[PDB]
Each structure stands twice: as structure tokens, then as C-alpha cells.
């Protein structure tokens with residue numbers, strides 16, 4: 001994909017449609033983070049008639065571009081579903097009918113625009129993906145009775161918690177590369193996510209890349225699942241940042257990688273493999289830090305969060321940080337098999353007793369949503385760096 005391949009005539013033709021579609025509103029059916037299952041209803045107008053949004057489609061995996069705000073769509077979903085239990089965790093997508101997959105709704109920007117951040121765009125892997133590999137797998141991977149609707153967790157991931165805190169739209173380009181992902185879409189670099197995003201952004205209206213907050217975390221699935229070499233992940237990561245900044249990005253959040261060798265799946269690994277993967281993470285994290293320093297010197301607005309250090313603290317002494325267990329999967333999974341993401345799994349007795357909000361790990365690989373929230377809160381804290389970005393205020 002290349003944004004340069006899109007012509008002015010193509011942009012005009014695409015934007016000249018003004019069709020309509022419906023909104024699928026998803027929600028968690030159970031009343032805590034222990035239960036990942038979800039269901040949906042069509043969004044409704046206040047009188048119960050079906051809600052529609054006007055706009056146009058584009059696909060190079062179709063996105064719907066509308067002038068209806070994300071806040072209004074969310075409100076319609078909340079009013080329609082009327083969930084009164086905790087952890088409703090509502091999300092929504094465009095869909096013409098029940099056979100459609102979950103398409104992202106993009107709210108076009110207005111002509112009148114200053115310098116405030118007006119959306120978050122996320123790049124990365126299974127620590128950030130909110131539904132891309134899930135759509136590519138026709139909703140079979142990860143299994144949606146046990147992993148929360150296309151997220152590799154029991155709920156929202158860190159980018160979603162940041163977006164919620166700042167009252168911003170989140171548009172996700174991250175692609176899960178966890179074990180078993182190979183079967184739905186060949187491994188691609190994070191630079192290919194940047195290229196794809198820029199092609200979709202060419203169809204947006206009044207889009208100013210300097211008003212996007214970009215998030216980038218990558219490399220964990222590459223080292224753990226694809227045995228990639230550090231020099232190749234460095235090249236992919238550097239290329240992505242060159243392309244993103246060349247396209248006009250100014251505001252980027254970077255993070256170091258957690259030491260994933262502390263995850264339960266490495267109970268089934270050799271010490272040699274633990275040492276090999278760990279050394280790659282250590283080396284790659286220094287490259288992330290050097291890239292951040294470089295882009296700061298070049299004049300960009302960069303934050304760098306040391307997720308590696310936060311995660312070392314959580315796995316070393318979970319109780320100091322509000323967790324009870326950082327060594328075991330919450331799910332009753334007693335092996336490290338790619339196939340396990342295809343099946344449903346129950347909580348262990350111990351996780352059910354203490355609750356999944358007290359565990360660091362959901363399955364054998366990924367953090368629980370309580371950890372994702374903990375990461376987001378650390379990143380949002382005063383002095384942690386986000387003050388350098390131009391956020392809107394909201395009196396509510």
C-alpha cells in the first residue's frame with residue numbers, strides 16, 4: 001500500500017458518496033472482568049428506531065467516514081443497550097447487516113481546526129490490537145468467549161484507557177502477532193501498518209497529522225513468536241518512524257517492551273530460550289530509547305514510557321502494586337500452545353477466588369485488563385510526559 005498511489009480523482013470520487021450504514025453496539029454480558037463474553041444490538045435513535053450514520057466507505061478492511069461524532073455514537077449505544085452492570089465496556093462499529101464484520105467508524109475532522117490533539121492512532125502488536133487480527137480470523141481467534149472481543153485480554157487495552165481518559169477517538173492499526181496469528185495474515189512489519197494508515201488517512205477530510213497522537217509499541221510478538229533478530233526489528237521500527245515523521249507526525253508515544261519471559265508460557269520453556277528472548281528485549285529496548293532521544297533532538301513531541309521497568313516491578317512484587325499473583329495464568333491453561341487461543345477456557349479456582357483484577361496474566365501470555373489500566377494510569381500521571389501534548393479540556 002502507498003498513499004501516493006491514491007489520486008485526487010480517487011479522493012473526490014470516494015468522498016462524493018454519502019450513503020448510510022448502521023452501528024453495531026457490543027457490550028460485555030457478564031458483570032466483571034472475569035467474563036469476557038460479549039453480545040450486540042443495533043444502535044437505536046431515542047424512539048427505538050434503528051440509528052443510521054451518513055458517510056462514505058473506503059477500503060484498500062473497509063472503514064466508514066462520517067461527520068457524526070464518536071461521542072454521539074457512543075451515547076446512542078449506551079442509551080440503546082441500557083447496561084446497568086459493571087464493566088459494560090461498550091464498543092461499536094459500522095455494519096450494514098448481521099453478516100458484516102466489525103468496521104471502524106472514522107469521524108472526519110472539521111475545516112476549522114487549531115493545534116489540539118483530536119484522535120489517537122495506534123500501531124503495534126498483540127499488546128495493542130483491539131480487533132484487526134480478530135476480523136482477519138472471522139472472529140475465531142482469539143476465542144471471544146475467553147478473550148474480550150478481539151483484544152488479547154479480558155477487557156480494554158492500555159491505548160483504550162488512555163483514549164477514554166482524554167475523551168479521544170482511538171483508531172487502531174495494531175495487529176496481533178501472538179502464536180497462531182500466522183494462519184490468518186502473513187507477518188508484516190510495523191512499517192506496513194504506518195503505510196496502511198497513511199493510505200486510509202488520504203481519504204479522510206481536513207486531516208492534519210500534526211493533530212494526531214500516535215502510539216507505537218512493537219517487537220514483543222516478533223521476538224517471542226517469530227524469533228526475529230534484533231537488527232531486523234530495529235530496521236522495521238526505524239523505518240516506521242522515518243515514514244511517520246516524513247508524513248507530518250509530530251506527537252508520538254513510545255514504550256519499551258515488557259520482559260515477556262516472566263509470562264506463564266515460559267514455565268514450558270528452556271532456560272536457554274528464556275535467556276535468548278530476554279537478551280533481545282534488553283537490546284531492543286535500548287534502541288527504542290535511542291530513537292526517542294533522537295526524535296526529541298530533531299524537534300518532535302515524543303514521550304517514552306518505560307513499560308519494561310513497570311512490568312519488572314509488577315512481576316517482582318505484585319502485592320506492592322495491588323495484585324496478588326504475577327506468576328500464573330488466571331485461565332486454567334497448563335501449557336503453551338498456539339491452538340489454545342481457538343478454544344474457551346475457564347478461570348482457575350484461585351483466579352475466581354481472588355478475581356482477574358488481582359492477576360497480572362490472563363492466559364499464559366498477555367496481561368489482564370487491570371494491568372492495562374495500571375499502565376495507562378502511570379502514563380497519564382502528572383509529570384509522566386503527556387503534558388507536552390495539546391489536549392482539549394472537557395468540563396464534564
Ligand SMILES: [Cl-]
Pocket residue numbers: 152153362363364365366367
Ligand atoms: Cl493470554
